[PDB]
């Protein structure tokens, strides 16, 4: 994969990812907030194409993510994030992708996702999240 | 079970828990750090006996937890925390309990777990972690 690191911001306005039912999560791009202004994140794209895009447009600032979850599993020899789900105080978005493999979830009692990092190759290999008050 | 919330502190010196190799996590108690003094957290006790105690004595401050992971799953028809694993920068302690049900893990790239809260009945029902830089 190519490693990426957005760094930390003020909050999240919008998530653009893509997925394929057959396989896994492909691309990932976040529109962050930065001191009350949108800041368009780097678009982190798969080595391959053919994915179905989605846009998760949050009602910022009153809408925020409370839990990220998904599944990891093996696609054509690659251990990757095969689906993602984003739960806010308002709604659930997803699951996007194949919901088979090993589960993971990050639930949040207090604080905000302010940043994403990871690695994307043919699919999303892994990711981490920056957390702040 | 009975809710506890130890609050937030400066770091962790020692974890004292009990577990049964056929059921779940039982007792849970933590010696935190608080500005350089040991802070003896209250002993959060299971309603029942028959568990095996373990003392996780960390070499604070050079040694600290990097990942908490474990499994949640059914025991006598409650969803409980069935096993825990504490991996520090120096070694792995656990798994303690039964490694069955739904995996979960909280890896940490940056920051420190500084506090625990949750709920213990016959077993550890659920828990959360306070994080700080």
């Amino acid at each position: 994969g190519k490693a990426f690191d957005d760094g930390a911001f003020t909050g999240i306005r919008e998530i653009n990812l893509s997925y394929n039912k057959e396989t896994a999560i492909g691309d990932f791009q976040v529109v962050y907030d930065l001191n009350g202004s949108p800041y368009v994140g780097q678009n982190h794209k798969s080595f391959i194409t053919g994915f179905t895009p989605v846009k998760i447009s949050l009602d910022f600032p009153s809408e925020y993510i409370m839990e990220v979850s998904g599944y990891t599993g093996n696609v054509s020899g690659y251990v990757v994030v095969r689906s993602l789900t984003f739960k806010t105080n308002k709604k659930t978005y997803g699951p996007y992708g194949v919901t088979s493999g090993t589960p993971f979830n990050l639930p949040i009692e207090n604080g905000l996702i302010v940043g994403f990092k990871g690695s994307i190759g043919y699919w999303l290999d892994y990711f981490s999240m920056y957390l702040s008050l | 079970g009975k809710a506890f919330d130890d609050g937030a502190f400066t770091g962790i010196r020692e974890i004292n828990l009990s577990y049964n190799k056929e059921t779940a996590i039982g007792d849970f108690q933590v010696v935190y750090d608080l500005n350089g003094s040991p802070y003896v957290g209250q002993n959060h006790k299971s309603f029942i006996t028959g568990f095996t105690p373990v003392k996780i004595s960390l070499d604070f401050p050079s040694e600290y937890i990097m990942e908490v992971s474990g499994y949640t799953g059914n025991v006598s028809g409650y969803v409980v925390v069935r096993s825990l694993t504490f991996k520090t920068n120096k070694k792995t302690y656990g798994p303690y309990g039964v490694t069955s049900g739904t995996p979960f893990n909280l890896p940490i790239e940056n920051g420190l777990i500084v506090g625990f809260k949750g709920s213990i009945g016959y077993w550890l029902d659920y828990f959360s972690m306070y994080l700080s830089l």
Partner: peptide, 14 residues
């Protein structure tokens, strides 16, 4: 101690 500010980071998952 550097001029770069820091943040809590959890992960990775994958």
């Amino acid at each position: 101690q550097s001029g770069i500010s820091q943040t809590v980071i959890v992960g990775p998952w994958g």
